């Protein structure tokens, strides 16, 4: 019932994601010189370095906020791809399945801790 435990658990999960080859296209902001139409399609850019920096600055109040920003990385990939068979889109679908498998317990444990605090 530790209400603060989610933060280290999210740092550890981000470390795993940065070690995965599938994260390489998503580690820094999309290069607008390589993709000059990107901002015509995508309203709010997001990347894993921006997520890690926001966490380490103390600017997430909950793991649900972190999870909304990671899911925006994946929805931006789905919106920008020209094909459901593209290389980079393929990489985002595998990384999303890995992220969702690992974040589920983080969210469950945090919500349980809050309910115990309010009991
Ligand atoms: C050649 N580019 C692509 O097929 C795709 S699919 C998703 C993307 C991306 O390039 C930029 C990053 O996000």
UniProtKB/Swiss-Prot annotation:
Expressed in myeloma and epidermoid carcinoma cell lines. Residues 1-106 form the Bromo domain. The modification Phosphothreonine is found at residue 44. The modification Phosphoserine is found at residue 90. It is found in: Nucleus. It is linked to Chung-Jansen syndrome: An autosomal dominant disorder characterized by developmental delay, intellectual disability, autistic features, anxiety, hypotonia, obesity, and dysmorphic features. Interacts with IRS1 and IRS2. Interacts (via bromo domain) with acetylated lysine residues on histone H1.4, histone H3 and H4 (in vitro). Probable regulator of the insulin and insulin-like growth factor signaling pathways. Stimulates cell proliferation through regulation of cyclin transcription and has an anti-apoptotic activity through AKT1 phosphorylation and activation. Plays a role in the regulation of cell morphology and cytoskeletal organization. This is PH-interacting protein. The lineage of its organism: Eukaryota, Metazoa, Chordata, Craniata, Vertebrata.
């Amino acid at each position: 019932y530790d209400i603060q435990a989610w933060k280290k658990q999210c740092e550890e999960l981000l470390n795993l994601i940065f070690q995965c080859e599938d994260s390489e296209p998503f580690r820094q902001p999309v290069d607008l010189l390589e993709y000059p139409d990107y901002r015509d399609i995508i309203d709010t850019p997001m990347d894993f370095a921006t997520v890690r920096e926001t966490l380490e600055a103390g600017n997430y109040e909950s793991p649900m906020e972190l999870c909304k920003d990671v899911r925006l990385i994946f929805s931006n990939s789905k919106a920008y791809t020209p094909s459901k068979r593209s290389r980079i889109y393929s990489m985002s679908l595998r990384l999303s399945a890995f992220f969702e498998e690992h974040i589920s317990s983080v969210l469950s444990d945090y919500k349980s801790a809050l309910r115990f605090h309010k009991r």
